[PDB]
Design an enzyme around this catalytic site. Structure first.
Site, PDB file in Angstrom:
ATOM      1  N   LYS A  95     -27.386 -47.866 -17.886  1.00  0.00           N
ATOM      2  CA  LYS A  95     -28.262 -48.507 -16.904  1.00  0.00           C
ATOM      3  C   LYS A  95     -28.712 -49.881 -17.414  1.00  0.00           C
ATOM      4  O   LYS A  95     -28.796 -50.166 -18.620  1.00  0.00           O
ATOM      5  CB  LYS A  95     -29.456 -47.577 -16.583  1.00  0.00           C
ATOM      6  CG  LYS A  95     -30.648 -47.801 -17.528  1.00  0.00           C
ATOM      7  CD  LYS A  95     -30.494 -47.178 -18.908  1.00  0.00           C
ATOM      8  CE  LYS A  95     -30.250 -45.672 -18.839  1.00  0.00           C
ATOM      9  NZ  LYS A  95     -29.875 -45.021 -20.134  1.00  0.00           N
ATOM     10  N   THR A 241     -37.385 -39.971 -22.180  1.00  0.00           N
ATOM     11  CA  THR A 241     -36.676 -39.870 -23.460  1.00  0.00           C
ATOM     12  C   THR A 241     -37.101 -38.647 -24.264  1.00  0.00           C
ATOM     13  O   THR A 241     -37.338 -38.780 -25.447  1.00  0.00           O
ATOM     14  CB  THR A 241     -36.832 -41.141 -24.331  1.00  0.00           C
ATOM     15  OG1 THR A 241     -38.227 -41.455 -24.480  1.00  0.00           O
ATOM     16  CG2 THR A 241     -36.120 -42.364 -23.726  1.00  0.00           C
TER      17      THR A 241
END
Ligand SMILES: NC(=O)c1ccc[n+]([C@@H]2O[C@H](COP(=O)([O-])OP(=O)(O)OC[C@H]3O[C@@H](n4cnc5c(N)ncnc54)[C@H](OP(=O)(O)O)[C@@H]3O)[C@@H](O)[C@H]2O)c1
Ligand SMILES: [Cl-]
Ligand SMILES: [Cl-]
Ligand code: NA
Length: 313
Positions: A95, A241
Protein backbone atom coordinates in the site's frame (compact mmCIF):
# COMPACT_ATOMS: atom_id res chain seq x y z
CA UNK A 1 5.64 -26.23 -6.89
CA UNK A 2 5.85 -23.12 -4.71
CA UNK A 3 5.48 -19.76 -6.37
CA UNK A 4 8.94 -18.28 -6.90
CA UNK A 5 8.98 -14.76 -5.48
CA UNK A 6 11.39 -11.99 -6.27
CA UNK A 7 11.58 -8.80 -4.23
CA UNK A 8 12.35 -5.43 -5.75
CA UNK A 9 13.72 -3.03 -3.10
CA UNK A 10 15.22 -4.00 0.26
CA UNK A 11 12.54 -2.14 2.17
CA UNK A 12 12.00 -1.78 5.93
CA UNK A 13 8.54 -3.33 5.58
CA UNK A 14 10.09 -6.14 3.56
CA UNK A 15 12.69 -6.94 6.18
CA UNK A 16 10.31 -6.70 9.14
CA UNK A 17 7.06 -8.19 7.79
CA UNK A 18 6.91 -9.51 4.23
CA UNK A 19 10.15 -11.44 3.91
CA UNK A 20 9.80 -13.38 7.13
CA UNK A 21 6.29 -14.42 5.90
CA UNK A 22 7.51 -15.42 2.42
CA UNK A 23 10.41 -17.32 3.89
CA UNK A 24 8.11 -19.32 6.20
CA UNK A 25 5.21 -19.88 3.75
CA UNK A 26 5.35 -23.33 2.07
CA UNK A 27 3.61 -21.91 -1.00
CA UNK A 28 6.23 -19.24 -1.74
CA UNK A 29 9.93 -19.53 -2.45
CA UNK A 30 12.17 -16.46 -2.22
CA UNK A 31 14.30 -16.80 -5.37
CA UNK A 32 15.79 -13.32 -5.86
CA UNK A 33 16.08 -10.02 -4.02
CA UNK A 34 17.13 -6.92 -5.88
CA UNK A 35 18.56 -3.62 -4.63
CA UNK A 36 20.10 -0.42 -5.96
CA UNK A 37 23.19 -1.71 -4.08
CA UNK A 38 24.22 -5.30 -4.46
CA UNK A 39 25.61 -5.13 -0.88
CA UNK A 40 22.12 -4.48 0.49
CA UNK A 41 20.56 -7.29 -1.59
CA UNK A 42 23.26 -9.60 -0.27
CA UNK A 43 22.57 -8.65 3.36
CA UNK A 44 18.91 -9.41 2.72
CA UNK A 45 19.62 -12.73 0.97
CA UNK A 46 21.90 -13.80 3.77
CA UNK A 47 18.87 -13.36 6.04
CA UNK A 48 16.06 -14.73 3.83
CA UNK A 49 17.68 -16.90 1.13
CA UNK A 50 17.55 -16.19 -2.60
CA UNK A 51 20.03 -14.70 -5.10
CA UNK A 52 21.07 -11.08 -4.49
CA UNK A 53 20.47 -9.05 -7.64
CA UNK A 54 21.87 -5.68 -8.64
CA UNK A 55 19.16 -3.31 -9.89
CA UNK A 56 15.51 -4.12 -10.56
CA UNK A 57 15.46 -4.77 -14.27
CA UNK A 58 17.76 -7.79 -13.98
CA UNK A 59 15.39 -9.34 -11.46
CA UNK A 60 12.39 -8.86 -13.76
CA UNK A 61 14.36 -10.67 -16.49
CA UNK A 62 14.74 -13.89 -14.50
CA UNK A 63 12.92 -17.07 -15.49
CA UNK A 64 12.88 -18.44 -11.99
CA UNK A 65 10.64 -15.58 -10.71
CA UNK A 66 6.87 -16.13 -10.96
CA UNK A 67 5.69 -13.19 -8.87
CA UNK A 68 7.29 -9.97 -7.66
CA UNK A 69 6.83 -8.25 -4.28
CA UNK A 70 7.09 -4.44 -4.63
CA UNK A 71 7.79 -2.61 -1.34
CA UNK A 72 9.19 0.53 -3.05
CA UNK A 73 8.19 4.09 -2.11
CA UNK A 74 4.63 4.93 -3.16
CA UNK A 75 5.63 7.29 -5.97
CA UNK A 76 7.77 4.57 -7.58
CA UNK A 77 5.12 1.86 -7.51
CA UNK A 78 3.45 2.47 -10.81
CA UNK A 79 6.56 2.35 -13.01
CA UNK A 80 7.77 -0.87 -11.45
CA UNK A 81 4.46 -2.70 -11.12
CA UNK A 82 3.86 -1.79 -14.75
CA UNK A 83 7.18 -3.25 -15.80
CA UNK A 84 6.86 -6.32 -13.60
CA UNK A 85 3.47 -7.17 -15.10
CA UNK A 86 4.79 -6.55 -18.62
CA UNK A 87 7.60 -9.01 -17.82
CA UNK A 88 4.76 -11.50 -17.13
CA UNK A 89 5.03 -11.61 -13.32
CA UNK A 90 2.18 -11.48 -10.79
CA UNK A 91 2.63 -8.55 -8.43
CA UNK A 92 2.16 -8.11 -4.67
CA UNK A 93 2.47 -4.32 -4.28
CA UNK A 94 2.65 -2.50 -0.93
CA UNK A 95 0.00 0.00 0.00
CA UNK A 96 -0.88 2.40 -1.37
CA UNK A 97 -1.12 0.47 -4.64
CA UNK A 98 -0.28 3.68 -6.43
CA UNK A 99 -0.74 7.46 -6.09
CA UNK A 100 -4.17 8.05 -7.74
CA UNK A 101 -7.24 6.33 -9.18
CA UNK A 102 -6.54 6.72 -12.93
CA UNK A 103 -3.06 5.28 -12.42
CA UNK A 104 -4.50 2.37 -10.42
CA UNK A 105 -6.99 1.56 -13.22
CA UNK A 106 -4.21 1.51 -15.85
CA UNK A 107 -2.25 -0.90 -13.70
CA UNK A 108 -5.20 -3.30 -13.33
CA UNK A 109 -5.80 -3.00 -17.09
CA UNK A 110 -2.21 -4.10 -17.81
CA UNK A 111 -2.58 -7.02 -15.42
CA UNK A 112 -6.02 -7.91 -16.78
CA UNK A 113 -4.80 -8.12 -20.39
CA UNK A 114 -2.28 -10.75 -19.30
CA UNK A 115 -4.30 -12.77 -16.81
CA UNK A 116 -2.00 -11.67 -13.96
CA UNK A 117 -2.88 -10.95 -10.31
CA UNK A 118 -2.01 -7.51 -8.95
CA UNK A 119 -2.71 -7.36 -5.23
CA UNK A 120 -2.42 -4.36 -2.84
CA UNK A 121 -0.73 -5.74 0.31
CA UNK A 122 -2.99 -4.44 3.08
CA UNK A 123 -1.99 -7.26 5.35
CA UNK A 124 -4.24 -5.96 8.15
CA UNK A 125 -7.30 -6.96 6.15
CA UNK A 126 -6.25 -10.60 6.54
CA UNK A 127 -6.31 -10.48 10.34
CA UNK A 128 -9.48 -12.29 11.59
CA UNK A 129 -10.01 -9.69 14.35
CA UNK A 130 -11.84 -7.25 12.09
CA UNK A 131 -14.38 -9.80 11.01
CA UNK A 132 -14.88 -10.82 14.66
CA UNK A 133 -15.55 -7.14 15.51
CA UNK A 134 -17.86 -6.84 12.51
CA UNK A 135 -19.78 -9.92 13.65
CA UNK A 136 -20.29 -8.46 17.12
CA UNK A 137 -21.50 -5.18 15.59
CA UNK A 138 -23.89 -7.08 13.29
CA UNK A 139 -25.22 -8.93 16.33
CA UNK A 140 -26.17 -5.57 17.87
CA UNK A 141 -23.66 -5.32 20.75
CA UNK A 142 -23.80 -1.48 20.55
CA UNK A 143 -27.01 -1.00 18.56
CA UNK A 144 -26.94 0.83 15.21
CA UNK A 145 -23.64 2.29 14.12
CA UNK A 146 -23.69 6.10 14.28
CA UNK A 147 -20.06 7.04 13.61
CA UNK A 148 -16.52 5.60 13.30
CA UNK A 149 -13.05 6.85 14.12
CA UNK A 150 -9.66 5.31 13.35
CA UNK A 151 -6.13 6.56 13.79
CA UNK A 152 -2.66 5.58 12.71
CA UNK A 153 0.12 7.88 13.88
CA UNK A 154 3.85 7.39 14.45
CA UNK A 155 6.93 9.24 15.73
CA UNK A 156 8.97 11.41 13.33
CA UNK A 157 11.45 9.13 11.53
CA UNK A 158 5.17 9.50 0.32
CA UNK A 159 4.00 11.92 2.99
CA UNK A 160 1.75 11.01 5.89
CA UNK A 161 -1.39 10.73 3.78
CA UNK A 162 -0.14 8.15 1.23
CA UNK A 163 1.97 6.20 3.65
CA UNK A 164 -0.06 6.22 6.88
CA UNK A 165 -3.44 7.82 6.38
CA UNK A 166 -4.33 5.15 3.84
CA UNK A 167 -4.70 2.77 6.77
CA UNK A 168 -7.59 4.47 8.67
CA UNK A 169 -9.17 5.35 5.33
CA UNK A 170 -9.07 1.66 4.29
CA UNK A 171 -10.50 0.65 7.70
CA UNK A 172 -13.46 3.04 7.16
CA UNK A 173 -14.09 1.35 3.80
CA UNK A 174 -13.88 -2.11 5.38
CA UNK A 175 -16.44 -1.34 8.10
CA UNK A 176 -18.69 1.28 6.58
CA UNK A 177 -18.89 0.00 3.04
CA UNK A 178 -18.57 1.12 -0.55
CA UNK A 179 -20.63 4.34 -0.58
CA UNK A 180 -18.20 6.53 1.52
CA UNK A 181 -17.89 10.14 0.34
CA UNK A 182 -15.39 12.83 1.20
CA UNK A 183 -16.67 15.65 3.46
CA UNK A 184 -13.61 17.72 4.45
CA UNK A 185 -10.05 17.31 5.64
CA UNK A 186 -6.93 19.10 6.80
CA UNK A 187 -3.45 18.29 5.71
CA UNK A 188 -0.49 19.82 7.56
CA UNK A 189 2.56 20.31 5.32
CA UNK A 190 6.01 20.98 6.76
CA UNK A 191 7.36 24.00 4.82
CA UNK A 192 10.91 22.85 5.48
CA UNK A 193 10.76 19.59 3.51
CA UNK A 194 7.48 20.11 1.68
CA UNK A 195 5.94 16.87 2.92
CA UNK A 196 2.58 16.11 4.50
CA UNK A 197 3.26 15.21 8.14
CA UNK A 198 -0.30 14.75 9.49
CA UNK A 199 -3.95 15.24 8.81
CA UNK A 200 -7.53 14.47 9.73
CA UNK A 201 -10.33 13.59 7.35
CA UNK A 202 -14.10 13.49 7.61
CA UNK A 203 -16.04 11.08 5.40
CA UNK A 204 -19.68 10.03 5.35
CA UNK A 205 -21.97 7.28 4.04
CA UNK A 206 -25.14 8.45 2.33
CA UNK A 207 -27.05 7.60 5.52
CA UNK A 208 -24.78 10.01 7.45
CA UNK A 209 -22.66 7.46 9.28
CA UNK A 210 -19.45 9.46 9.64
CA UNK A 211 -15.81 8.48 9.75
CA UNK A 212 -13.14 10.62 11.35
CA UNK A 213 -9.69 9.56 10.33
CA UNK A 214 -6.50 10.86 11.94
CA UNK A 215 -3.01 10.10 10.72
CA UNK A 216 0.51 11.44 11.11
CA UNK A 217 4.19 11.10 11.67
CA UNK A 218 4.71 13.79 14.31
CA UNK A 219 2.98 11.85 17.06
CA UNK A 220 3.21 8.99 19.58
CA UNK A 221 2.80 5.60 17.83
CA UNK A 222 -1.00 4.93 17.95
CA UNK A 223 -3.19 2.55 15.88
CA UNK A 224 -6.74 2.13 16.96
CA UNK A 225 -10.36 2.45 15.90
CA UNK A 226 -13.68 2.99 17.64
CA UNK A 227 -17.41 2.80 16.82
CA UNK A 228 -20.14 4.84 18.44
CA UNK A 229 -23.52 3.12 18.35
CA UNK A 230 -27.06 3.80 19.43
CA UNK A 231 -26.65 1.85 22.65
CA UNK A 232 -22.88 1.80 23.23
CA UNK A 233 -19.37 2.04 21.89
CA UNK A 234 -16.70 -0.45 20.84
CA UNK A 235 -12.94 0.28 20.46
CA UNK A 236 -9.74 -1.66 19.99
CA UNK A 237 -6.00 -0.85 19.93
CA UNK A 238 -3.18 -2.31 17.77
CA UNK A 239 -5.62 -2.62 14.92
CA UNK A 240 -3.16 -2.14 12.01
CA UNK A 241 0.05 -3.80 13.19
CA UNK A 242 -0.73 -6.39 15.86
CA UNK A 243 2.16 -8.79 16.41
CA UNK A 244 1.59 -12.34 15.18
CA UNK A 245 1.51 -13.61 18.79
CA UNK A 246 -0.51 -10.68 20.19
CA UNK A 247 -4.08 -11.40 21.47
CA UNK A 248 -6.56 -8.61 20.45
CA UNK A 249 -8.86 -7.23 23.15
CA UNK A 250 -12.23 -5.80 22.08
CA UNK A 251 -13.56 -3.15 24.52
CA UNK A 252 -17.26 -2.44 24.76
CA UNK A 253 -19.06 0.09 26.95
CA UNK A 254 -22.78 0.48 27.35
CA UNK A 255 -24.96 2.08 30.06
CA UNK A 256 -23.61 0.85 33.47
CA UNK A 257 -21.77 -2.12 31.91
CA UNK A 258 -18.38 -2.55 30.15
CA UNK A 259 -16.86 -5.75 28.78
CA UNK A 260 -13.52 -6.82 27.27
CA UNK A 261 -13.17 -9.91 25.02
CA UNK A 262 -9.73 -11.48 24.33
CA UNK A 263 -9.57 -12.94 20.77
CA UNK A 264 -7.01 -15.44 19.40
CA UNK A 265 -3.66 -14.24 18.06
CA UNK A 266 -3.05 -14.56 14.32
CA UNK A 267 -0.21 -13.72 11.92
CA UNK A 268 -1.82 -11.35 9.46
CA UNK A 269 1.49 -10.95 7.56
CA UNK A 270 1.63 -14.70 6.86
CA UNK A 271 -2.08 -14.79 6.11
CA UNK A 272 -1.83 -12.03 3.46
CA UNK A 273 1.21 -13.59 1.77
CA UNK A 274 -0.66 -16.92 1.79
CA UNK A 275 -3.82 -15.42 0.25
CA UNK A 276 -1.63 -13.89 -2.49
CA UNK A 277 0.05 -17.22 -3.16
CA UNK A 278 -3.22 -19.22 -3.16
CA UNK A 279 -4.71 -16.81 -5.70
CA UNK A 280 -1.66 -17.11 -7.95
CA UNK A 281 -1.58 -20.94 -7.66
CA UNK A 282 -5.33 -21.41 -8.15
CA UNK A 283 -5.87 -18.60 -10.74
CA UNK A 284 -8.79 -17.35 -8.63
CA UNK A 285 -8.08 -13.61 -8.42
CA UNK A 286 -10.90 -12.15 -6.24
CA UNK A 287 -12.68 -9.29 -7.94
CA UNK A 288 -13.40 -7.69 -4.55
CA UNK A 289 -9.67 -7.11 -4.03
CA UNK A 290 -9.27 -4.92 -7.06
CA UNK A 291 -12.59 -3.13 -6.70
CA UNK A 292 -11.73 -2.36 -3.04
CA UNK A 293 -8.30 -1.03 -4.12
CA UNK A 294 -9.93 1.22 -6.69
CA UNK A 295 -12.50 2.61 -4.25
CA UNK A 296 -9.65 3.14 -1.83
CA UNK A 297 -7.58 5.01 -4.42
CA UNK A 298 -10.55 7.26 -5.17
CA UNK A 299 -11.13 8.31 -1.54
CA UNK A 300 -7.45 8.97 -1.10
CA UNK A 301 -7.52 11.25 -4.15
CA UNK A 302 -10.71 12.90 -2.89
CA UNK A 303 -8.91 13.58 0.40
CA UNK A 304 -5.75 14.98 -1.17
CA UNK A 305 -7.73 17.20 -3.60
CA UNK A 306 -10.43 18.24 -1.09
CA UNK A 307 -8.32 18.86 2.03
CA UNK A 308 -7.51 22.33 3.23
CA UNK A 309 -3.71 22.31 2.97
CA UNK A 310 -1.99 24.15 5.81
CA UNK A 311 1.71 24.91 5.62
CA UNK A 312 3.59 25.54 8.85
CA UNK A 313 4.93 27.41 10.38
N1 LIG B 1 7.99 0.43 6.78
C1 LIG B 1 6.67 0.27 6.98
O1 LIG B 1 6.21 -0.44 7.87
C2 LIG B 1 5.55 0.91 6.20
C3 LIG B 1 4.51 1.57 6.87
C4 LIG B 1 3.47 2.14 6.14
C5 LIG B 1 3.50 2.12 4.75
N2 LIG B 1 4.54 1.49 4.14
C6 LIG B 1 4.63 1.40 2.68
O2 LIG B 1 5.54 0.41 2.18
C7 LIG B 1 6.25 0.90 1.05
C8 LIG B 1 7.70 0.92 1.52
O3 LIG B 1 7.78 1.71 2.71
P1 LIG B 1 9.02 1.44 3.73
O4 LIG B 1 8.63 2.26 4.94
O5 LIG B 1 9.46 0.02 4.01
O6 LIG B 1 10.17 2.29 2.94
P2 LIG B 1 11.77 2.08 2.84
O7 LIG B 1 12.29 1.29 4.02
O8 LIG B 1 12.21 3.43 2.34
O9 LIG B 1 11.98 1.07 1.59
C9 LIG B 1 11.76 1.45 0.23
C10 LIG B 1 12.87 0.75 -0.56
O10 LIG B 1 12.71 1.16 -1.92
C11 LIG B 1 13.99 1.32 -2.52
N3 LIG B 1 14.14 2.55 -3.34
C12 LIG B 1 14.22 2.62 -4.67
N4 LIG B 1 14.37 3.91 -5.03
C13 LIG B 1 14.40 4.65 -3.91
C14 LIG B 1 14.56 6.00 -3.64
N5 LIG B 1 14.72 6.88 -4.66
N6 LIG B 1 14.54 6.40 -2.34
C15 LIG B 1 14.39 5.54 -1.32
N7 LIG B 1 14.25 4.22 -1.55
C16 LIG B 1 14.25 3.78 -2.83
C17 LIG B 1 15.07 1.09 -1.47
O11 LIG B 1 15.47 -0.24 -1.78
P3 LIG B 1 16.97 -0.51 -2.32
O12 LIG B 1 17.71 0.69 -1.80
O13 LIG B 1 17.34 -1.87 -1.75
O14 LIG B 1 16.79 -0.44 -3.82
C18 LIG B 1 14.29 1.12 -0.15
O15 LIG B 1 14.82 0.13 0.74
C19 LIG B 1 5.64 2.26 0.70
O16 LIG B 1 4.62 1.92 -0.26
C20 LIG B 1 5.05 2.72 2.04
O17 LIG B 1 3.80 3.40 1.94
C21 LIG B 1 5.54 0.88 4.81
CL1 LIG C 1 -1.11 -3.74 6.19
CL1 LIG D 1 -6.08 -2.76 25.26
NA1 NA E 1 -6.26 20.20 -1.47
Amino acid sequence: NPIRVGVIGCADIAWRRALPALEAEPLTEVTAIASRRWDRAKRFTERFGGEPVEGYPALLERDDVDAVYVPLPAVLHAEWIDRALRAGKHVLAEKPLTTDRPQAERLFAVARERGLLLMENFMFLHHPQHRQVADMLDEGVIGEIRSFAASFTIPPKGGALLDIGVYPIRAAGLFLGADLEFVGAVLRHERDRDVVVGGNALLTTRQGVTAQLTFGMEHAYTNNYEFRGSTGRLWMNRVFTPPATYQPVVHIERQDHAEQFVLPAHDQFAKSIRAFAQAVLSGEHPREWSEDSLRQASLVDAVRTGARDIYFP
